[PDB]
């Protein structure tokens, strides 16, 4: 949409003012969804290799929680980060053309019309 | 734009024609395949000597030495062709009907 | 590892295992000919691996305890079946022999790996090239039908072709008669039910078709019964011979990768032995193929991946 | 014609190209070709690329066709194509002949030749420049610099071709 | 390109001929260095949708 | 072949691919383009059976044809511009004259008629490449040069790729087949709105990559190639013919199977563009791969099909591929969908 | 040792052109680094003028540009005259 | 035993599992310690704490 | 609990999507009338930057 824009250094995943923004939390409900689907993976793999998925090796599924669980918040942070960025150039641009965004006047109900449509 | 121009755009044309227009025998295509790259090639030098573009006269000949890779890559595969069915002709090239 | 990627790499090959003991043998013959007695006696003269003629349970004889399993739980068939009943309906004949060509196969793929692994030569009875005359010949008095062998040969294309061929064969020669006279020596009362029809096409369709066949693929070592006696006359001839024809003598370490990439991958040399081929003798519809897989999953040790099975006694699970 | 000498060149270019891309017999189309190849050469010369012209003479003329003209030796079909065996490649050829011969005349004409771009079909001699070269050549001095500033592209075209006879030897033994 | 990196690393990839005014062998200009000088410069930081 | 060649041959595939989305250079993304044909063919004659020399031409055949005809567009490019920089092209008549390059090089109009029987001729880990890592290449250029697409054009593409691409499956009976027919629906998909927002483009290809990745090793596990063959596999794995259900349903596009996330968002970039008849015949048509869809869904788990009785022989061994990254491919190409706001990664 | 000597020894003994031909490559790519004159070389493959040495705008604070080629101040390549 | 032959996973491969720890404790305590000084730069860079 | 934590709650929940439903709006506004213009800070398709070119003298006087 973002590529291109200025100060864009290609193949960064989180750049340096990106840190400006408050960190997710270890219990974001979206985190602790990456961790679940971390989790679904362990019994898929034991699964799919025919063994007791319920307790078939904790140090398999272990690594698959923490493995999730990690790329999740790094993740996080960049989608926190480009939306933080989408919606803070859209503020300097709407101060930038103010020509173009004018506020309409507000009337109160108690003058505009809307023609009732009776139902029958 | 010049008619030496157009004459091989029009060479490449009728070469992509050709190629695409196909006939019995594989080997002609073949011959077609890196025909029209020669044209390619031919007014790739064109322009670049035209526009004195110095640096680009990088471009003719490694344009054609990957045009021969391929070439290379295209005969390669045709002999297969020929040591299972006798000749290169492409009306039997349809053993993947299914 | 295996000869997965990663060993192939650090320079393990398979020629510089090999050695001039390195041969396929099949020592075939006739129904009960004595050919299971040599089988033995020219492994142990040069030391190759032997491996038993295969039957219906080889393949219960190779996983687990390598022991039999139920005839229902594996297999279904019952050569014992088709001996006293020539002719049934629930098709014993076909489904004995199609099972016995995979359980062949399996045993070929087994002596391959082991071959390939140490360098040493295998002798096996009744190769799966051979497992045709059978067939063929249940056919000719009526065992099977026409639309039986298009499965058994389409299966055998599609699987015996990648399987190089043997080096040496032995075809102890035994005569009707003879066999027609010592098969009420035996005493098995299954194998008193055997019909001098079916008894005669098996021999005529040996040396007419199983030697020719694979003549050009391996050098034919002919043997009179007499011969298989003397098994030290049999020693040296096989060892006075280098078995040109073939491509096994032309084989390397590329066309070995392939090889021991399939005979590993016990699932993959049996995987084109399941055909879809709709045959009414073979054919298990779901329900019964459901209930015998479940009475096959609760089994011991089949419940789960072979080292993870509790029930046995794997401990560790929670870590393994 | 003195004039348009390398529109000459280029209509001969073409008319070979049209006749070996009609699918004749491939030694026959290799003919065809050889000949557009050894026209297009003057073209490029006659611009001032003699390395250029000179070059793919060497690698395409006396390259390309030679193991080319190989392979359809080994291929010796028993009936052999000459271009009389079917009305196909007559009838390319006459018209090759035919829309060639059309929009040069049209190009004789007025000169506004519009067919898929714009074309000003002028005497090829005026686009050249008034710029003289000194001592270097413009040509020898560009390929030149594929030693100095032709760093990526000298290695992924060694890469390739290394990768390039590696390929032809696993797809040819055949397992 | 869709990962620029050359950009990240700073290494010169394919940027030395991309254009006929860069840096040139012994100096040897092309025939429009100054339409393509004057050109490239009005369109720096400029955007392709309004620079056209 | 040669594990040790074999390598390094597909790992040049990767290099040239590479190569395609790291050159500024319109010359270079051409060197990615045929750097990754040169090392593509051998892995498609790795099993060198007639079919594969068979797949192999028709595939060398087309993907030589665009790539030359792709220079051409560069050559106009050049002829009418005098710049090699990789972006917006400068000329109407290249410009449609590499959309057609670059469409062959994908096969979505009438140029995907090499896309079903290249498939079924190679092998299954050959399929895997074809269908999933020799896709990115030629949407890497699209994506880089979409601004400037003619959109009449692109979008008559994307069509005709998901209408053929629909009708070509509920014929197929080969898993082969059935599955390159619906790689083509899912490329119109892409393409499709590749003009508008190339951010779902990319996110259309990383959530259809995954499906691919995961269909293909499962029906490599299943050592299945045809309807019957899979018919087979719920007898001896019924887990495996499980999952691939779920993931088969997650390739309809069914909520909330992650797999509707592409479409669901392609319709709404669309509808931002005031176009609207676009999204909606594009949804209807995409019915049509799910019928096929189902239809394998119907033979693999939902009735158990008759079995043989060599199967028994089957239960006895365990398997000894090791699929890696199978677990984390069904997962994350199933499940995927509350996580959808993970958009703005890509922008 | 003893089996590098005796690889060396067979090799030249029956693969001579071997032996040469990986020789002559093995010296070729090793002493231009240790070459001195190279950097004698490129100095030389500079001060060869091609084109015209364009002259500078003479408006003070540059002393080291030549106001004339005979004069003592810029570059001097006696050094070349005597190589 | 049941099985005749010892298979690949039928033993606690201790080096591999040690690893597989080894790689999530030192997974874990990098993304407690990330989180940390990230909350604590973000406090200071706006001026918050 | 009283029709207060009701009536507040929901009193929250309203402005908060009504925040949201005007920004959703005056995003897509911006980005049809950013896309036609320009000139600011995102879609900015790439140009050739200055650096790459040669203001060193040519062999040609003028160039
Ligand atoms: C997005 C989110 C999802 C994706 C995330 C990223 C991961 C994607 C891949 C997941 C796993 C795929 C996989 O393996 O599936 C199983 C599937 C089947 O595996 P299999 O059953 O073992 O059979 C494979 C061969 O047939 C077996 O043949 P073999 O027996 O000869 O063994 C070959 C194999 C075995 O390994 C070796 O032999 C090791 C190499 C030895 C020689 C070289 C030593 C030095 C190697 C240095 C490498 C660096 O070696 C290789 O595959 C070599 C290539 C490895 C990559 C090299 C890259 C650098 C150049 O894999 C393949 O078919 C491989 C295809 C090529 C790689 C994956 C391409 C598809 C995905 C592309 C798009 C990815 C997302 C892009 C955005
Ligand atoms: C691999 C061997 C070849 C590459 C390394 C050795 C040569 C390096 C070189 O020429 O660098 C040139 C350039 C750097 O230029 P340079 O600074 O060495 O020389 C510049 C010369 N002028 C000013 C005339 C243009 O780097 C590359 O080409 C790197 C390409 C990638 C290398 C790694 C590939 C994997
Ligand atoms: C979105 C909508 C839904 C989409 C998905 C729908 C999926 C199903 C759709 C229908 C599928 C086709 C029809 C049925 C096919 C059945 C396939 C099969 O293999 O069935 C038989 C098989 C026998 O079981 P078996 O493989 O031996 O494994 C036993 C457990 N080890 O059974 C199995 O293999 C199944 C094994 C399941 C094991 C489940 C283990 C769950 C463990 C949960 C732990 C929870 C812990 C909670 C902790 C809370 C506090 C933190
Ligand atoms: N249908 C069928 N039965 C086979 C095949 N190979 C072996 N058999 C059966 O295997 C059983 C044992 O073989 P016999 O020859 O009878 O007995 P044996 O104990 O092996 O004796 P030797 O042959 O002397 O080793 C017989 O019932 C054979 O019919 C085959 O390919 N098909």
């Given at each position: 949409?973002?590529?291109?824009?200025?100060?864009?250094?290609?193949?960064?995943?989180?750049?340096?003012?990106?840190?400006?923004?408050?960190?997710?939390?270890?219990?974001?409900?979206?985190?602790?969804?990456?961790?679940?689907?971390?989790?679904?993976?362990?019994?898929?793999?034991?699964?799919?290799r025919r063994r007791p998925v319920v307790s078939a090796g904790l140090h398999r599924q272990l690594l698959y929680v923490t493995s999730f669980v990690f790329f999740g918040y790094y993740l996080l942070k960049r989608q926190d980060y480009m939306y933080a960025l989408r919606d803070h150039d859209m503020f300097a641009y709407v101060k930038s053309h103010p020509e173009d965004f004018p506020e309409k006047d507000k009337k109160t109900y108690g003058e505009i019309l809307e023609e009732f449509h009776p139902v029958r | 734009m010049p008619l030496v121009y157009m004459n091989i755009i029009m060479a490449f044309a009728i070469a992509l024609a050709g190629l695409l227009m196909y006939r019995?025998?594989?080997?002609?295509?073949?011959?077609?395949?890196?025909?029209?790259?020669?044209?390619?090639?031919?007014?790739?030098?064109?322009?670049?000597?035209?526009?004195?573009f110095t640096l680009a006269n990088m471009m003719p000949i490694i344009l054609l030495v990957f045009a021969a890779c391929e070439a290379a890559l295209g005969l390669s595969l045709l002999v297969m062709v020929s040591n299972t069915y006798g000749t290169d002709y492409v009306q039997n090239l349809n053993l993947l009907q299914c | 590892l295996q000869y997965g990627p990663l060993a192939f790499v650090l320079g393990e090959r398979t020629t510089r295992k090999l050695t001039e003991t390195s041969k396929v043998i099949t020592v075939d013959g006739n129904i009960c000919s004595g050919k299971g007695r040599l089988a033995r006696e020219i492994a142990e003269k040069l030391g190759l691996r032997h491996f038993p003629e295969a039957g219906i349970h080889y393949a219960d004889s190779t996983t687990g305890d390598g022991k039999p399993l139920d005839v229902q739980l594996s297999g279904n068939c019952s050569l014992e079946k088709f001996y006293d009943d020539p002719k049934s309906n629930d098709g014993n004949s076909y489904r004995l022999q199609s099972w016995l060509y995979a359980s062949r196969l399996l045993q070929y793929a087994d002596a391959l790996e082991h071959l390939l692994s140490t360098g040493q030569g295998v002798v096996l009875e009744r190769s799966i090239y051979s497992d045709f005359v059978f067939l063929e010949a249940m056919y000719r008095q009526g065992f099977i039908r026409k639309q039986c062998v298009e499965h058994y040969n389409e299966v055998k294309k599609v699987t015996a072709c990648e399987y190089l061929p043997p080096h040496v064969v032995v075809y102890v020669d035994v005569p009707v008669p003879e066999i027609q006279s010592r098969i009420q020596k035996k005493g098995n009362p299954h194998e008193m039910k055997i019909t001098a029809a079916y008894l005669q096409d098996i021999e005529n369709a040996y040396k007419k078709t199983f030697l020719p066949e694979m003549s050009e693929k391996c050098e034919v070592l002919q043997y009179s019964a007499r011969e298989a006696e003397?098994?030290?006359?049999?020693?040296?001839?096989?060892?006075?011979?280098?078995?040109?024809?073939?491509?096994?003598?032309?084989?390397?370490?590329?066309?070995?990768?392939?090889?021991?990439?399939?005979?590993?991958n016990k699932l993959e040399v049996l995987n084109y032995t399941t055909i879809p081929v709709?045959?009414?003798?073979?054919?298990?519809?779901?329900?019964?193929?459901?209930?015998?897989?479940?009475?096959?999953?609760?089994?011991?040790?089949?419940?789960?991946?072979?080292?993870?099975n509790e029930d046995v006694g794997d401990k560790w699970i929670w870590l393994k | 014609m003195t004039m348009y000498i390398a529109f000459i060149l280029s209509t001969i270019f073409v008319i070979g190209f049209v006749g070996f891309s009609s699918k004749p017999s491939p030694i026959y189309g290799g003919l065809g070709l050889i000949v557009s190849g050894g026209v297009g050469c003057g073209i490029v010369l006659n611009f001032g690329g003699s390395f250029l012209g000179l070059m793919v003479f060497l690698i395409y003329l006396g390259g390309m066709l030679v193991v080319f003209g190989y392979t359809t030796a080994m291929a010796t079909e028993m009936y052999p194509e000459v271009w009389v065996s079917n009305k196909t490649v007559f009838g390319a050829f006459v018209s090759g002949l035919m829309m060639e011969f059309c929009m040069v005349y049209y190009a004789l004409k007025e000169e506004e030749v519009e067919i898929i771009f714009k074309f000003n079909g002028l005497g090829d001699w005026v686009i050249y420049d008034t710029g003289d070269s000194g001592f270097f050549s413009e040509e020898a001095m560009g390929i030149a610099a594929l030693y100095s500033y032709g760093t990526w592209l000298v290695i992924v075209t060694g890469w390739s071709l290394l990768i390039g006879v590696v390929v032809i030897m696993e797809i040819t033994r055949g397992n | 390109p869709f990962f620029d990196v050359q950009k990240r690393l700073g290494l010169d990839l394919d940027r030395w001929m991309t254009i006929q005014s860069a840096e040139q062998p012994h100096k040897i200009p092309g025939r429009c260095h100054a339409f393509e000088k004057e050109w490239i410069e009005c369109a720096h930081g400029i955007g392709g949708i309004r620079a056209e | 072949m040669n594990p040790i060649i074999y390598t390094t041959l597909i790992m040049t595939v990767m290099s040239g691919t590479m190569l395609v989305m790291?050159?500024?250079?319109?010359?270079?993304?051409?060197?990615?383009?045929?750097?990754?044909?040169?090392?593509?063919?051998?892995?498609?004659?790795?099993?060198?059976?007639?079919?594969?020399?068979?797949?192999?031409?028709?595939?060398?055949?087309?993907?030589?044809?665009?790539?030359?005809?792709?220079?051409?567009?560069?050559?106009?490019?050049?002829?009418?511009?005098?710049?090699?920089?990789?972006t917006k092209m400068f000329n109407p008549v290249a410009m449609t004259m590499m959309t057609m390059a670059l469409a062959m090089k994908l096969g979505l109009s009438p140029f995907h008629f090499w896309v079903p029987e290249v498939t079924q001729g190679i092998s299954l880990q050959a399929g895997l490449l074809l269908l999933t890592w020799q896709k990115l290449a030629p949407l890497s250029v699209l994506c880089q040069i979409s601004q400037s697409i003619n959109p009449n054009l692109m979008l008559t593409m994307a069509m005709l790729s998901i209408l053929i691409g629909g009708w070509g499956g509920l014929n197929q009976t080969q898993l082969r087949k059935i599955m390159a027919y619906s790689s083509i629906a899912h490329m119109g998909w892409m393409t499709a709105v590749l003009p508008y927002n190339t951010t779902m483009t990319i996110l259309n290809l990383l959530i259809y990559i995954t499906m691919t990745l995961a269909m293909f090793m499962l029906l490599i596990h299943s050592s299945a190639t045809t309807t019957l063959s899979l018919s087979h596999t719920w007898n001896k794995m019924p887990v495996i013919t499980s999952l691939m259900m779920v993931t088969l349903l997650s390739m309809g596009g069914l909520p909330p199977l992650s797999g509707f996330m592409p479409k669901w968002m392609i319709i709404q970039e669309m509808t931002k563009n005031e176009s609207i008849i676009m999204p909606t015949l594009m949804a209807m048509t995409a019915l049509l791969n799910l019928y096929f869809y189902m239809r394998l869904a119907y033979s693999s788990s939902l009735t158990m099909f008759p079995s043989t009785n060599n199967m028994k022989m089957k239960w006895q061994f365990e398997h000894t591929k090791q699929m890696k990254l199978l677990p984390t491919m069904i997962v994350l190409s199933t499940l995927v969908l509350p996580m959808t706001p993970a958009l703005s990664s890509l922008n | 040792?003893?089996?590098?000597?005796?690889?060396?020894?067979?090799?030249?003994?029956?693969?001579?052109?071997?032996?040469?031909?990986?020789?002559?490559?093995?010296?070729?790519?090793?002493?231009?680094?240790?070459?001195?004159?190279?950097?004698?070389?490129?100095?030389?493959?500079?001060?060869?003028?091609?084109?015209?040495?364009?002259?500078?705008?003479?408006?003070?604070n540059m002393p080291d540009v030549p106001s004339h080629p005979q004069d003592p101040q810029g570059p001097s390549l006696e050094w070349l005259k005597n190589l | 035993?049941?099985?005749?032959?010892?298979?690949?996973?039928?033993?606690?491969?201790?080096?591999?599992?040690?690893?597989?720890?080894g790689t999530s404790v030192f997974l874990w305590i990098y993304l407690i310690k990330q989180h940390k000084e990230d909350v604590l730069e973000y406090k200071r860079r706006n001026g918050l704490e | 609990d009283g029709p207060e934590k009701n009536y507040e709650k929901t009193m929250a929940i309203l402005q908060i999507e009504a925040e949201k439903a005007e920004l959703r709006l005056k995003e897509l506004e911006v980005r049809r009338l950013m896309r036609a213009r320009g000139d600011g800070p995102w879609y900015q398709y790439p140009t050739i930057d200055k650096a790459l070119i040669d203001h060193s003298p040519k062999t040609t006087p003028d160039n």
């Open positions: 949409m973002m590529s291109g824009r200025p100060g864009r250094v290609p193949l960064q995943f989180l750049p340096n003012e990106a840190r400006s923004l408050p960190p997710p939390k270890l219990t974001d409900p979206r985190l602790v969804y990456m961790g679940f689907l971390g989790y679904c993976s362990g019994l898929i793999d034991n699964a799919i | 019995s025998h594989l080997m002609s295509s073949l011959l077609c395949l890196e025909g029209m790259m020669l044209s390619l090639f031919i007014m790739s030098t064109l322009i670049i000597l035209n526009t004195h | 003397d098994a030290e006359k049999v020693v040296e001839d096989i060892e006075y011979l280098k078995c040109d024809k073939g491509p096994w003598p032309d084989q390397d370490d590329r066309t070995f990768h392939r090889l021991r990439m399939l005979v590993q709709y045959l009414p003798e073979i054919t298990i519809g779901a329900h019964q193929s459901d209930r015998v897989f479940q009475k096959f999953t609760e089994l011991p040790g089949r419940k789960y991946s072979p080292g993870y | - | - | 790291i050159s500024s250079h319109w010359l270079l993304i051409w060197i990615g383009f045929e750097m990754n044909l040169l090392a593509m063919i051998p892995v498609l004659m790795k099993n060198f059976n007639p079919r594969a020399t068979e797949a192999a031409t028709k595939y060398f055949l087309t993907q030589a044809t665009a790539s030359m005809m792709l220079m051409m567009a560069i050559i106009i490019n050049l002829l009418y511009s005098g710049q090699w920089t990789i | 040792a003893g089996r590098i000597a005796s690889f060396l020894k067979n090799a030249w003994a029956k693969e001579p052109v071997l032996v040469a031909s990986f020789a002559i490559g093995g010296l070729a790519i090793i002493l231009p680094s240790l070459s001195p004159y190279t950097n004698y070389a490129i100095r030389i493959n500079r001060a060869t003028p091609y084109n015209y040495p364009v002259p500078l705008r003479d408006d003070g | 035993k049941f099985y005749i032959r010892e298979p690949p996973h039928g033993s606690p491969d201790w080096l591999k599992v040690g690893l597989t720890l | -």
